[PDB]
Amino acid sequence: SGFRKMAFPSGKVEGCMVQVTCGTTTLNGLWLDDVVYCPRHVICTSEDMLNPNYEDLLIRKSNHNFLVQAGNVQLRVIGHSMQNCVLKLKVDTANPKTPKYKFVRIQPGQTFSVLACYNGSPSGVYQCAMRPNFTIKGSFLNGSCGSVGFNIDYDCVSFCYMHHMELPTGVHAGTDLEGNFYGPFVDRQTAQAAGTDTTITVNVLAWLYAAVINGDRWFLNRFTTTLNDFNLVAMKYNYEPLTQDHVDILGPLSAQTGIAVLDMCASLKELLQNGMNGRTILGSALLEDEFTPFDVVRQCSGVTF
Amino acid sequence: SGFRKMAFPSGKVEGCMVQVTCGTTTLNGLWLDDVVYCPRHVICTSEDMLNPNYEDLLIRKSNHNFLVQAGNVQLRVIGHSMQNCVLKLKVDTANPKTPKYKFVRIQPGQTFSVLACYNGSPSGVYQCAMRPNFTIKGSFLNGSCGSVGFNIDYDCVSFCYMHHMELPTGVHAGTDLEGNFYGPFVDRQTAQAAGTDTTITVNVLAWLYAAVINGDRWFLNRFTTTLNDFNLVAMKYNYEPLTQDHVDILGPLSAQTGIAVLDMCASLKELLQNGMNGRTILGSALLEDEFTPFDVVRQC
Ligand SMILES: COCCO[C@@H](C(=O)Nc1cncc2ccccc12)c1ccc(Cl)c(Cl)c1
Numbered sequence: 001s002g003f004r005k006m007a008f009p010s011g012k013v014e015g016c017m018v019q020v021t022c023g024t025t026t027l028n029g030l031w032l033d034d035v036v037y038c039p040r041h042v043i044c045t046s047e048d049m050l051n052p053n054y055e056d057l058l059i060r061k062s063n064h065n066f067l068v069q070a071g072n073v074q075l076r077v078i079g080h081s082m083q084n085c086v087l088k089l090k091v092d093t094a095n096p097k098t099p100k101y102k103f104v105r106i107q108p109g110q111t112f113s114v115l116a117c118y119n120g121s122p123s124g125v126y127q128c129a130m131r132p133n134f135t136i137k138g139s140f141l142n143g144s145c146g147s148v149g150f151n152i153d154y155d156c157v158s159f160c161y162m163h164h165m166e167l168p169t170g171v172h173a174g175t176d177l178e179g180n181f182y183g184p185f186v187d188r189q190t191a192q193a194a195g196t197d198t199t200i201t202v203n204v205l206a207w208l209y210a211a212v213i214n215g216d217r218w219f220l221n222r223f224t225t226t227l228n229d230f231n232l233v234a235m236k237y238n239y240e241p242l243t244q245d246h247v248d249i250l251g252p253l254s255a256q257t258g259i260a261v262l263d264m265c266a267s268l269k270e271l272l273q274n275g276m277n278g279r280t281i282l283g284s285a286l287l288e289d290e291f292t293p294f295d296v297v298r299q300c301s302g303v304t305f
Numbered sequence: 306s307g308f309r310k311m312a313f314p315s316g317k318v319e320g321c322m323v324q325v326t327c328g329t330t331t332l333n334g335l336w337l338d339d340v341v342y343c344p345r346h347v348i349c350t351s352e353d354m355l356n357p358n359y360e361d362l363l364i365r366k367s368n369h370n371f372l373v374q375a376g377n378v379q380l381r382v383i384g385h386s387m388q389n390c391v392l393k394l395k396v397d398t399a400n401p402k403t404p405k406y407k408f409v410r411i412q413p414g415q416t417f418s419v420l421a422c423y424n425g426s427p428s429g430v431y432q433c434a435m436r437p438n439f440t441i442k443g444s445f446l447n448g449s450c451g452s453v454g455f456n457i458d459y460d461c462v463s464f465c466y467m468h469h470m471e472l473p474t475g476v477h478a479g480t481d482l483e484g485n486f487y488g489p490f491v492d493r494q495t496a497q498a499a500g501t502d503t504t505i506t507v508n509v510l511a512w513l514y515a516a517v518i519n520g521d522r523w524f525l526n527r528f529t530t531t532l533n534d535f536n537l538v539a540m541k542y543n544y545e546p547l548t549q550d551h552v553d554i555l556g557p558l559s560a561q562t563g564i565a566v567l568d569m570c571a572s573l574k575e576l577l578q579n580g581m582n583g584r585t586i587l588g589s590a591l592l593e594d595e596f597t598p599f600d601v602v603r604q605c
């Protein structure tokens with residue numbers, strides 16, 4: 001019993017965190033094989049950041065300008081290249097702690113674990129979701145740039161996020177491990193604002209299934225709805241549309257709890273229109289949208305890594 | 306910016322998780338140096354569960370009865386001893402991944418990270434608080450016994466919890482790493498119930514200070530209160546009494562935000578009376594009590 005916000009075990013990722021220093025800037029790098037990946041803004045000064053030409057800034061840098069540190073051991077940079085907004089520093093030593101890994105770009109609504117680092121040292125791990133507005137509601141202080149987001153599939157770490165910056169509302173923007181930003185953001189000091197966010201409908205339903213598995217059933221009702229009628233109601237409450245793919249993905253949870261997806265949708269519809277009425281679900285007075293259907297199944301079945 | 310429930314990186318603890326099998330029972334062990342620590346109930350059968358005599362059950366055991374597995378390598382048990390409700394299995398190999406560590410018993414209200422394991426394999430990590438009723442609201446399935454609770458402050462891992470059982474309400478009971486249970490619980494199938502839980506008042510105040518540091522101020526008011534008047538209000542809402550120690554501990558947050566402890570106490574009093582009125586604090590519609598004053602300062 002119990003439902004917690006649970007991150008993947010961070011051990012395989014901790015073995016990859018290094019400190020990358022370029023001039024006055026110190027941030028984090030992901031050391032995989034003989035390459036260190038880090039945000040390309042590490043090469044910027046306070047003037048550069050305003051309107052930077054990263055190709056021109058990087059051509060002026062030499063390998064000895066990047067000080068890479070893995071623990072108390074300085075790595076030798078033997079090459080540097082740029083792939084979108086990520087800087088790749090070729091090093092003379094392959095990371096012996098490199099896990100089996102892939103680079104994956106995730107979609108809005110997908111969850112991942114963040115290993116927050118400062119000076120190449122992991123300080124904490126937390127579970128977050130890629131918001132529909134392509135920002136993450138992380139917890140990051142200055143120096144966390146280069147901290148990565150990841151999932152674990154069997155014994156393979158899928159790297160999906162690298163932290164680049166914090167937006168004026170306190171939310172975070174970053175890129176996949178190929179340097180492509182999530183959302184309409186750029187790594188330049190200019191006016192940028194996160195779009196109006198929406199609630200991840202499929203994840204709210206997955207969490208309602210997690211509440212039922214845990215014995216919380218007050219919100220259940222005798223009703224069902226059409227997918228179209230539900231989507232018309234959901235869109236009015238700033239909820240993401242629920243697709244047939246989402247209904248299919250919620251199939252195993254529907255089979256386990258005996259609550260059809262459109263049946264749980266009718267409960268969600270009622271919760272939106274009427275509220276919780278002083279009651280809680282899984283210790284929360286709000287509908288939680290950062291547990292995907294796979295997260296719920298994994299946590300309620302004890303899948304190991 | 307931002308405030309999240311944040312666990313410590315679990316890597317140093319993952320390197321210690323092993324599977325311990327004794328007969329039909331399989332649970333988790335913590336491999337540190339040449340000793341594997343695990344709940345002593347691993348030696349129990351179904352019939353010796355209501356009233357087990359662990360001293361007598363352990364004397365009948367031999368080292369080859371305990372099958373310890375670290376990954377795909379079986380460890381050889383060269384000795385066994387019992388310290389309170391924890392079983393200590395001496396092994397013929399010191400764990401090369403043993404971190405710098407300490408065993409610390411924590412107090413109610415204190416937080417720690419839990420590395421949930423099944424068959425000696427980590428499946429997830431989360432943040433917990435030791436409830437005032439000495440239970441933890443964990444997320445644990447059958448086979449999670451032996452999973453540990455820890456804090457990792459400055460290179461060293463302080464082990465503070467080892468999971469032993471689930472109570473009838475779904476909450477969890479366990480011991481420190483010396484086998485002493487937290488709370489009035491025993492490792493017997495006898496009727497046991499968690500006491501009436503209460504809110505960790507000092508942690509709620511610490512979280513209100515984190516909300517102020519993050520720019521949330523809607524809940525602040527012009528009032529202050531006496532510590533006694535606050536405690537009389539708080540006790541009526543099932544909140545733990547706030548002691549002078551708690552007020553002292555909240556001093557640095559009070560200095561950073563410019564809001565006196567008794568002043569924030571008046572904000573907490575008002576919130577308890579009024580509710581949130583559709584508003585949230587740090588993305589939560591309830592007052593959060595699993596962030597200690599130390600956690601707030603560390604994270605901010
Ligand atoms: C692998 O051996 C497990 C033995 O069962 C224990 C047991 O409740 N542990 C479990 C731990 N956590 C969550 C659980 C959720 C569902 C079921 C069990 C859970 C247990 C039972 C009664 C007593 Cl008195 C004791 Cl000392 C321990």
Ligand SMILES: COCCO[C@H](C(=O)Nc1cncc2ccccc12)c1ccc(Cl)c(Cl)c1
Pocket residue numbers: 025026027041049140141142143144145164165166186187188189190306
């Ligand atoms: C090591 O210095 C990195 C500086 O990164 C800045 C920056 O906001 N990053 C930070 C990251 N995360 C949380 C923060 C919380 C407080 C402060 C900063 C935070 C930043 C600012 C604007 C731009 Cl356009 C860019 Cl590319 C980067």
Ligand SMILES: [Cl-]
Pocket residue numbers: 123124311312313600603
């Ligand atoms: Cl922490």
